[model samples]
Target: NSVRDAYIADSHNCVYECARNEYCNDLCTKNGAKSGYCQWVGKYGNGCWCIELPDNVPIKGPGKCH
Candidate 1:
């Protein structure tokens, strides 16, 4: 089955490589996401991934944060 209400926002580079959780939390909030955190991608290393509450599914790329 396919996942819903979750998105991977690796395009918007985090402030720092492997940025702290707080950084990502604020970042996502600023962009309209309910919550977010830093995640590690095998090829890209670390980036921020935001989560939207139900009914507000993400669209497009990292820029969709807002």
Candidate 2:
């Protein structure tokens, strides 16, 4: 049997760089994501901002947000 895979996009396209929490939070808020905590993850030399979606909550694409 094959397992279903799920993935989320990293805010920053460049790796090995860091961005301010406020910046990440701003994007999330602007995108209509829930406001709570701004989470950052590091990879190699760069990182991205992301938040966990509540179970059953749907994540939509760019055009969908506006």
Candidate 3:
């Protein structure tokens, strides 16, 4: 499994880095993701753990979000 890493790319539909939450929210809306919360317990620390993401975009690091 692979969790969606935030602030990794423009094509990324998940949340951005903790410092770029504004951009995260913006991406979420434009990318069509239902939600974006910096969830905990990630393979590479905590990420936005985006939901309702598209099927095209792939995760950056390792670990599954849901």
> How many steric clashes does model 3 contain?
1
Residue 63 lDDT in model 3? 38
TM-score of 1: 0.49
lDDT of each: 0.52, 0.35, 0.49
* Model 1 agreement with the true structure over 1-66: per-residue lDDT tens digits: 133334344334222244577886786677677787776663335666567723343333433323
Per-residue lDDT of candidate 3, residues 1-66 (tens digit): 233434333333332455455555565546656656554555455455556655455544443333
Candidate 1: pairs in clash:
none
Query: What's each prediction's clash count?
Result: 0, 4, 1
TM-score of each: 0.49, 0.35, 0.46
lDDT leaderboard ranking:
1, 3, 2
lDDT of 1 at 11: 38
lDDT of 1 at 19: 56
Off by over 4 Å in 1: 1-17, 42-44, 53-66
Cα RMSD, each candidate: 6.5, 9.3, 6.7
Candidate 2 global TM-score: 0.35
After superposing candidate 3, which stretches have Cα over 4 Å from the reference?
1-16, 20-23, 61-66
